[PDB]
Swiss-Prot record, chain B:
Regulator subunit of pancreatic ATP-sensitive potassium channel (KATP), playing a major role in the regulation of insulin release. In pancreatic cells, it forms KATP channels with KCNJ11; KCNJ11 forms the channel pore while ABCC8 is required for activation and regulation. The gene is ABCC8. It is found in: Cell membrane. This is ATP-binding cassette sub-family C member 8. The chain crosses the membrane at residues 25-42, 64-80, 140-157, 159-171. Belongs to the ABC transporter superfamily. ABCC family. Conjugate transporter (TC 3.A.1.208) subfamily. Forms an heterooctamer with KCNJ11; four ABCC8/SUR1 molecules interact with one KCNJ11 homotetramer.
From Swiss-Prot, chain C:
The modification Phosphothreonine is found at residue 341. One of its GO terms (biological process) is apoptotic process. There are two PtdIns(4,5)P2 binding sites: A canonical site where the phosphate groups of one PtdIns(4,5)P2 molecule are coordinated at least by residues Lys-67, Trp-68 and Arg-176; a non-canonical site where the second PtdIns(4,5)P2 molecule is coordinated by both KCNJ11 and ABCC8/SUR1 residues. This is ATP-sensitive inward rectifier potassium channel 11. Residues 90-120, 132-142 are extracellular.
Amino acid sequence: YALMVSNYLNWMVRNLADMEIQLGAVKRIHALLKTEAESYEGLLAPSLIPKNWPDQGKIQIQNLSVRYDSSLKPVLKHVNTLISPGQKIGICGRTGSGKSSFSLAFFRMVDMFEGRIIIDGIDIAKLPLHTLRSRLSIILQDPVLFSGTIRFNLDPEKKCSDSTLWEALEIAQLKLVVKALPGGLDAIITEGGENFSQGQRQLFCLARAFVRKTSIFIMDEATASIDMATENILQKVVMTAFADRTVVTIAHRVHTILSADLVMVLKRGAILEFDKPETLLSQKDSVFASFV
Amino acid sequence: LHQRAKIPWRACTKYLSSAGILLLSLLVFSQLLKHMVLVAIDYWLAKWTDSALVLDQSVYAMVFTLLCSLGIVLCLVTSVTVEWTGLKVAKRLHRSLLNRIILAPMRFFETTPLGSILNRFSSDCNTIDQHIPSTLECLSRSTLLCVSALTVISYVTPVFLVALLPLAVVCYFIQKYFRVASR
Amino acid sequence: MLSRKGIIPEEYVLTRLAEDPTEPRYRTRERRARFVSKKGNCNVAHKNIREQGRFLQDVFTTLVDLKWPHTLLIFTMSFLCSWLLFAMVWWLIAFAHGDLAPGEGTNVPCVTSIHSFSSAFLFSIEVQVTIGFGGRMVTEECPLAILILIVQNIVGLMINAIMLGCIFMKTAQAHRRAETLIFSKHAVITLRHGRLCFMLRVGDLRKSMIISATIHMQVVRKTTSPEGEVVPLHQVDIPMENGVGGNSIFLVAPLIIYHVIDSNSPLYDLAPSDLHHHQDLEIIVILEGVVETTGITTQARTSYLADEILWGQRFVPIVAEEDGRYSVDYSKFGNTVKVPTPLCTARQLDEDRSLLDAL
């Protein structure tokens, strides 16, 4: 055993060093596990405080104080505005202050310092985030599709059949693609559709929005689209209005964010002008200048 | 100040705790018992040879045969236990990591880079699922063999431990410097 | 052997990507490299020196330079090696001559009363130290003993002569007197006679004078010429502003060593804000002179980093005539007191005077 001490001290030290360098890779994993937030704590009766489901779309924003870190820059200041049932108020604020943050925080994904984010007159500030975030359709400027089956991509949880899901998808847009699709409503989207289309992505987003049966559909203008594709998106918006009757679109495309119902400007972190009709905004001077 | 990042129990305990008590106890017991049998069979060989120089020898062979069989059996048990414990720890860590990452704020993903999350997910889980079990078994075997070897040496010659402590001090210094550089 | 041989395969499909560097702050790691320390000890580590034995050829300069404990070791080892070397020779010539074997009454040993190696070693001690305890003589029987006696005496006298010389040059050392020459920790700047001057104080603690005390002064700075030259440490000399333009100084009581800043001085564009910690200035000061008690020339050195300057202060008076004699109070030697000053570059002072005169 004296002979074999020489190659046991060596292994002890070397494996100690290897274990240290490898245990570093467990420290970093527990470091990621040390980020606890996003608690699904609904301090109410999840089935008795709201109804079966909110569907009216009369969610009037009342004194929504918005924050993300609550450190140096609030955005909203007591937005006392009401969206009437069916009144699709498409309002785009100042691109620098409240353009994207407003839509992002509409899903209770930001720090609401005070006030109450009403949903059809109900307190949605104490609603189950698992259920509340599912019955409010939205779209984003940067579309992205998770790879998998067309049914899985469009609506995995709902699992709507061909009679409902396929009919809605085909009617909304991409009828030619539907025929081209080798499988149809259950065909695998290759790598998220790396070569399918760009404007059809937003079209499928609106189709998936129509699949959740959610009355509201918060929209946003595409980063880039063709003139023909812009007309296709316009027809999709018209179809969405004629089918769901509710929408809230904050479109950065100023030369195409005019046709709407109501306008609201959030300049320097304040609501400088509100106009429930569109003609009230185009009648003024400062609001008209900022809207043209 | 942060150079001494060696975690004797800060991070090692987390790995063992994730495995569980019903598996940590079995693993430690199996390793200790297997090495005790190896010490016993070596000691029995010495006694049998000593009694065969001045010449019940069939009984020596019987005991020696029934000690090698126990050694082989204990080796298999220890190997299976170490591998199984590593698998369970890796599975539980991956499940917990996915569950927590699901329940996170959007601000976290917006702030922390996608590269950081992706790297410490894939690469770190692979290291903890295919390289830590083998390294732990090798480290355990090495250090337990070394303690066994020095104990046997001191048992054969009690004088040795008198000069072991100065020699061990030198060994300790070598270990410290190597680790600080090797990292 | 976790990965003694199994580390050869490579996945090459790793998910490693960019990560936060978390590099340490450079300001904390970087510290101003002083050319010379507060008390001599030039902190200029040399590099890539080609050794041609020059450092070991001048063995006597080396011997005097070494510390006393090392000189004592060399002193002891030189004597003891010679003593042991000749002890071997004396023992071996006796054992060759066959005089410690017989004990015969008619044989005459060539070295009387050699019975062992201890006797031979004691005989070597006696010959080279010149004690001669008489019990170990040299007879006339073998002429080789006489030759070895001559060699041992001459070697011993040479070794004693060399060690005496090294000791005498080590007692005449004057490096411990340069530690009684005292320079103020931090220097000041103040307008004396309407001219902005860089002051300083130097004092002597011993009562023995230093003759021919010469003060030099240099401004170490990284200076670049218009022609692309980048000198790393362009040592620029500084006038001492004496009464006869020389570098001489007569030091009994602590004196003020001030340098008037003019158009020729490199310190002519110094701003009080530009006098911070991370600044490229170091004002070397050299106080030479021959010590009167030994006649050996010395240097006293110090450096004044930019942060070691205190703008707009003056030194407190130190000498008072409390009794018939003059009294110097070294307690206030360092002390400085603030005084109003134009907090701007000295160039803007000459320009102001010129503009006022024209107006």
